[PDB]
Symmetry: D2
Subunit: 440 residues, 4 copies
């Protein structure tokens, strides 16, 4: 699946619909980024710029002008075409093709932006700009307003009101359209297929990085060239470190392995976590921690629906975890007291769920302590985990265990749809998958 | 292979050996880098910082102080240890472990650098600093010198002489040690193995990006997690674009495919280019252009040795190319005149060779028009190419063809060693390899 | 006269009255300014900061917070008291005295501003700030908003709307109160008294700078320590240069001298220009140019009233000037055509009138081509001039003559009040004043 | 007196004589400076720029290039001429006149500096630059070096060594030439004449600022338009504040008045302090403190000579002060112990002497605790003072007294010359001068 021109158009109109009359919205592209010396990282367009343009070039600015409640138009600044530059660093849209390709009214050369932008802004009342987002953008916008302010003898005037569009735009991205969901559904399928391959490929003696390569190859072959975030393969005690990306260790028979990987497909992010035995068979100590994390996930998946919140479902997961850990002797005392003492926090120290979208940790307001009432169209992760440090004062068999199980869901009219259930998580189904592969 | 502690030590002493008495050299680490929102790219240490420390953390500064011709010592500023931070973003060396692990005399907290650095610099005559390399570094160094200048009532004084260490350090990196060469030799083997796999895997109907995934998987499985540069898979007319990285097109039976990929192994870069038929069989038009590019490579490999230069070997390649193109009717006129008219340049528009090392386009002085006399220990690429644009006024059969063949060599006492000959380039050996794979 | 506490209070309330509910206005003080090395210029408070505080310290910020339509309060950040610092660089208000002295609700240490300001702004909808006014201020405000934006996990939120208060505040300053006018009336008397002294003191052989010293001494003795702008004493051909401040030349018998000086009294600016013979007797050529400039001034003073504009009165002055210059042969042709050709502009090349107040070139909107309808309370200068360059192609006797006559007026309910008529401008009254002094 | 072209030439050659072969020295002019809105302070050229050019324009850069030990030349960047701009903001030298007027080899337009400077610097080994002196200068120089560094394919190269010229240039300014001394001698005469006038004019009932106006008028009439520093008139308890410039108080019969004023004449600074009774007659308590300060000055003036130091003469002054204060009961205990306890410091808390020159607090190295051996040609102030705070626990009659007496001297071959003895300081000679004036 993909995002059509029509959808990019609707999004711009949805934004403009909310802008005041006599205003201009300025959305800048991401700068290129050095990796070392003159070699650069693969380009990643700014998410908000991408959201409105589907245009993957740097040195580009969308300008949406609203004259009144029925009049508005779009100017794109982008790089001019250049034979030399393209024979080297590759094709560019240019100005001729831009209006038709991107559905914008006008297209001007980025090199002229300092001589043009202030003219577009002259006489307006409001300018919507994301201050401090990019330095070069602030330079451009401040430079344009200075011309207008100091140029009253040339009958210029600056908009006196600047407004952050980020709250507005991020509220928009918080609610996914059917097109967005179809794309995310596929990023789900692709990411899940990679996690299955990792489970099937893993043998003791392989390195954590070998499963990374397997996952990335799978993303790639389905047309998801880059991951959504730096992949984590934490075997053994490395699984207790939430952002472990060294992936440098030999995987040992007896250890668990926590794999956290996500693809980026048409800009949208998959994000799955699966934990499993390197030797294909859970031990009793591993099962005892795993069944608690799994029940937390399965209950959350039953509970997530419109009307509830992340805060609320989290309360149910806390209860499941404290109760489970008491029964294992990892915690001692009354369950209810232990909850009010947050006794779980040394072992489960992150949130249950985050928004998912163009960014893996997606934009949108959570509300105080994530108490926001969920509504259909919201996409989020469900990711309970338990992490018992190597030197935790608990029964020995639980020390140095890190387990997380993460799924991606979308809130629907009567509950949620699970986008990542195509990769197994029930421990017997994991063990069966892995036994199958060792045959073949 | 790898780089030992001893080697990192020697390098620092080699630098200090050249510093003046009463001086301090300041080498800063690379900053982390955003990819989108709060997710970051995989960390890539500054090459010069890596060269002297083998230390892959940000927020770290090497300070080498030379008191006189026999007295000198090293202070490392690096991040302090922090349980919380490491449970999240992963392990850190800290100050306790640093002196022993990295072979430095002292280790201080980066957070204290503003309160400490000016003390280290007080009373010196010279400070070696790479101005404009990183903004945060310039802020730190300028801030330290301002304290010293304005603090004469506290008996402080600033070094009045600042010197760029980059010329000195890059001259050092231009000459590889036996350890460096062993590492580069393996980056050669790994990169070559990937290009062979790409040749064996390619079928018509596959996308350019599918061969990218095959190459990256191969790098990964040999412990080269990231490439040295953004991989190019240019099939058909896409091969005429020198930095084509979209890799988005279906590969067609009849087209050639130019694959330019390199691994990064222990920090050092492989860089290979191979061009071949998507269907495993060169056409006559393809052979006619390929044999010219290949003869250029084979002659260059015979000629490269101590005493000659890149400029000089390039002259021989120009002659081979002009002569070849005349015989095909791509160029008309006297060969010698055509050379003095640079008639080849529309078709071969980049250099023959670049330095290779910690950076793929490696540091070191080429001399005017790359006329520098080569010496043993120099590592460089040999990469002739011919690119006939789709709309070139030449016989039709040559239009839209892009061919390059690149090998990595090291200059030795009596010639060069080819690090990448383990992947085939003779057209019959390419066709044989590909026929073999299609069986299976 | 002076400005009371009550007036400073009213001004703040007038500003707040116009702010939106749930907003904060941030007004910063001027930075100290180096003259050479470590010696600084006399401090000059930012006019807008002065306008609301009457507080002549740097490192100070007024914060006016509007909670709703009946609730609002003021926090002043200012420098803490310090015995050492004051024994050196002089007294400071501190925080204890500030609420009572300046009539503000709270007073905090400027050194704490980064730790406090974001707390004041948390949860508001609008912040009024003058962007690009001072660099240190922008750093402070951007820093405060970044904390609030990135701090949603600490239940912080930034105002999404920033608004320039300058248009609002400058509209306020455009209309002077009775207190302001009494002060300006005295700045008028003082400035006029200086121009009379200059006329009485001038002999041929004195230098232009000697009359500067006389003027400044007069300002000083009436308690106007500094001038409003750099004083101009342009004798002879130096009078053709509108901002001639070298004042370095010997004044010659036969030349005219244009003196443009203004005092600064309680922050408010006088601005007078008078031109006169260095030898106390106008020649015929001087009278012929002088009578045109004078009639322009006298007619303008009759015409200036509520209902008309500067543009309109300027049209009458153009007519007077073109007609006068035709009769002298300086211009040739029909008067009406010459006006439509702007034939006067080589000789009268600046505006007739500028707003006067806390700044000599005072704030407030002129409207296109200064067409704004005048209203009572507006203070402005009336300053026609004619400047015949030394090499102008006109009759010899007019070359190298520069004459301007400037008065300060305030628009009243039925016309204007002249604040500077206490210094003579009729040529016979100038000559009489000067003859009297020579006795002284 | 004044500074000739020849002297400016010698100074440049003296600098070049010390530069390395293959180097360029870059000396930038001062930027204009805002006072309020669009009105600016009187221009004050950077002292070091003035020192080598005698050129009082902004947007100007001296470039001294040293090719070898006998070859060197000067390029001045300065503002181009412009009719419009000069008819407004006044005359400019331009490029045509500059070589002859300023004795430089070449003169280029400042507007071209970014396109030219890097060409001048290309291929050099050293560039002398004052980093952090002015922001615009650092931008220019960093910009020029970046072009050269990144432009090796255009056979450019940057000087790898940057050196601060300030230590070198300030050592030069520390030793005044006969021309400089003649100028300083006159700045002495002028400043002294102002202090005499202040003594003769002062009556009780006058304000501190009235004597400021008298002093400035005197500076002005001798052709010293601006003071060297912000004038201090501290009567009564205001005299205990070392940098008291409010000068806002009525001068009371019975109080002392400390006047600290200095002129700026041809760029060079006078700096005199005199203290005296507002009513022309010292009381006994005033005499008792005054005679200690005066004996300190008179002994210092006998002692200052080549071979001694400021530190050393200061030791003698400490002894005089401690002994004097003991005899008055202001200090109790053994004199020698009290000295080793620095018991004087609450009452005499600044240095005895500072370098004087183009800056009042002039450049040049003092050595640790001002221990530098004095040599002929050094110009410095001699300024002992005693300041008894209003709430000091000492006999009542001494509280709230501030007395300083400052003279300017130049070290000669066999002692010093007093430049400011033309204004009286013996108390009977003060009282006589003041009685004479009252007749006016
Ligand atoms: Mg265990
Ligand atoms: Mg073809
Ligand atoms: Mg004349
Ligand atoms: Mg007393
Ligand atoms: Mn997640
Ligand atoms: Mn290459
Ligand atoms: Mn005026
Ligand atoms: Mn002094």
């Amino acid at each position: 699946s993909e995002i059509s021109r029509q959808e990019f158009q609707r999004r711009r109109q949805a934004l403009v619909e909310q802008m005041q009359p006599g205003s201009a919205a300025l959305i800048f592209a991401a700068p290129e980024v050095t990796r070392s010396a003159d070699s650069e990282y693969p380009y990643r367009q700014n998410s908000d710029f991408w959201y409105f343009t589907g245009f993957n070039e740097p040195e580009a600015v969308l300008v949406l002008i609203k004259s009144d409640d029925t009049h508005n138009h779009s100017v794109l600044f982008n790089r001019v075409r250049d034979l030399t530059a393209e024979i080297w660093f590759g094709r560019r849209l240019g100005q001729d093709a831009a209006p038709e390709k991107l559905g914008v009214d006008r297209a001007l050369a980025f090199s002229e932006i300092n001589q043009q932008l202030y003219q577009l802004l002259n006489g307006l009342d409001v300018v919507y700009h994301a201050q401090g987002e990019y330095a070069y953008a602030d330079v451009i916008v401040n430079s344009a307003l200075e011309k207008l302010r100091k140029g009253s003898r040339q009958n210029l005037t600056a908009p006196a009101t600047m407004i952050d569009w980020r709250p507005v735009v991020h509220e928009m991205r918080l609610f996914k359209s059917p097109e967005e969901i179809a794309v995310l559904r596929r990023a789900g399928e692709i990411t899940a297929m990679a996690h299955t391959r990792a489970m099937e490929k893993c043998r003791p003696g392989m390195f954590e990085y070998h499963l990374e390569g397997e996952i990335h190859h799978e993303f790639n072959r389905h047309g998801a060239r880059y991951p959504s975030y730096n992949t984590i393969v934490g075997s053994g005690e490395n699984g207790c470190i939430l952002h472990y990306t060294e992936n440098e260790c030999e995987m040992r028979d007896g250890d668990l392995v926590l794999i956290a990987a996500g693809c980026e497909y048409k800009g949208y992010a998959g994000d799955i976590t699966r934990t499993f035995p390197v030797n294909g068979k859970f031990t009793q100590a591993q099962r005892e921690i795993y069944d608690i994390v799994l029940e937390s996930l399965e209950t959350s998946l039953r509970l997530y629906r419109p009307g509830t919140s992340i805060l609320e479902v989290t309360g149910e997961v806390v209860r499941i975890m404290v109760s489970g850990l008491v029964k294992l002797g990892i915690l001692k005392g009354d369950v209810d007291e232990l909850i009010a003492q947050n006794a779980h926090r040394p072992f489960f120290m992150h949130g249950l769920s985050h928004w998912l979208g163009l960014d893996v940790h997606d934009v949108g307001v959570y509300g105080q302590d994530r108490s926001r009432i969920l509504e259909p169209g919201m996409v989020l992760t469900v990711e309970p985990g338990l992490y018992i440090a190597p030197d935790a004062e608990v029964p020995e068999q639980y020390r140095g265990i890190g387990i997380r199980i993460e799924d991606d869901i979308v809130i629907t009219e009567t509950g949620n749809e699970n986008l990542t259930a195509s990769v197994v998580k029930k421990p017997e189904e994991i063990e069966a998958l892995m036994v199958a592969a060792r045959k073949q």
